[PDB]
Amino acid sequence: MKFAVIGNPISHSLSPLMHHANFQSLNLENTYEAINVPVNQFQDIKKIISEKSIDGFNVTIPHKERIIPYLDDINEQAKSVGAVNTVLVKDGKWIGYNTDGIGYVNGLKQIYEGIEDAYILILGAGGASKGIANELYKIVRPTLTVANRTMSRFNNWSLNINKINLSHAESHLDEFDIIINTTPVISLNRLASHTLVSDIVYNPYKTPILIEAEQRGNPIYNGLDMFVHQGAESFKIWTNLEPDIKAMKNIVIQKLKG
Numbered sequence: 001m002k003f004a005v006i007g008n009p010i011s012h013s014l015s016p017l018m019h020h021a022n023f024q025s026l027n028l029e030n031t032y033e034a035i036n037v038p039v040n041q042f043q044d045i046k047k048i049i050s051e052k053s054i055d056g057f058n059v060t061i062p063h064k065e066r067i068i069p070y071l072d073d074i075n076e077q078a079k080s081v082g083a084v085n086t087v088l089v090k091d092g093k094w095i096g097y098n099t100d101g102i103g104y105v106n107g108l109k110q111i112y113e114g115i116e117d118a119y120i121l122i123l124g125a126g127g128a129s130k131g132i133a134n135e136l137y138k139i140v141r142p143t144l145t146v147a148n149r150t151m152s153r154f155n156n157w158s159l160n161i162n163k164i165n166l167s168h169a170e171s172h173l174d175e176f177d178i179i180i181n182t183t184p185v186i187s188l189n190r191l192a193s194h195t196l197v198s199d200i201v202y203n204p205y206k207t208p209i210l211i212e213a214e215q216r217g218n219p220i221y222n223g224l225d226m227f228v229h230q231g232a233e234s235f236k237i238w239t240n241l242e243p244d245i246k247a248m249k250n251i252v253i254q255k256l257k258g
């Protein structure tokens with residue numbers, strides 16, 4: 001089967017390196033190649049893909065919304081986040097999926113015991129935040145809380161979740177078992193001792209919030225696992241097989257060192 005990643009730029013993508021490691025562990029005769037698609041040539045996307053006989057592809061900067069009109073169908077999750085990172089070519093039909101959020105959430109699940117009873121705060125109300133909150137909503141029993149600087153951003157949200165501003169997150173910070181920053185931030189001055197602090201970025205390997213949270217002697221978690229888990233989730237969709245998460249993360253790490 002033939003896979004890819006589209007984007008502009010595409011050369012620093014670690015998707016092919018990673019999906020390949022997965023193919024070699026599963027003993028699969030797949031290719032996964034980086035495809036450079038400038039904005040100016042994006043209108044010819046159906047043709048760039050189909051001439052290469054592509055089965056499924058990831059979509060990254062700056063085409064995650066740009067791809068949407070070319071899809072024949074799109075899932076609720078993508079539609080909701082308003083962005084597509086995965087497309088399935090399934091008998092000439094293009095179908096758009098979004099695995100970033102489930103990708104972050106499946107990673108967290110592994111490194112956080114009993115996430116179903118977790119008091120989770122998320123910072124940010126934009127699209128990455130939305131995608132994670134949708135996925136959590138399905139597995140977390142206690143109501144989610146999303147904090148944002150502007151209340152209006154929640155108008156197109158769809159969840160029955162608590163929605164607060166940033167100063168109110170600061171002063172109730174100790175009610176939370178996990179905090180997830182999706183913002184590129186708060187005062188950690190009421191930060192409970194046990195609280196896990198997470199950012200969906202892994203370059204830099206630690207953002208300011210994670211730095212300070214670590215000095216306060218808290219557990220921290222960056223976006224590395226999100227990146228592996230979103231691609232693993234694309235792979236499940238495309239192929240109906242189980243990805244080797246350890247092989248995929250180990251190669252990305254080795255590449256990151258160096």
Ligand SMILES: O=C(O)C1=C[C@@H](O)[C@@H](O)[C@H](O)C1
Nearest residue numbers: 005013014015058059060085
């Ligand atoms: O750098 C990459 O190759 C990617 C990064 C993220 O945007 C992912 O959402 C995308 O599926 C692939």
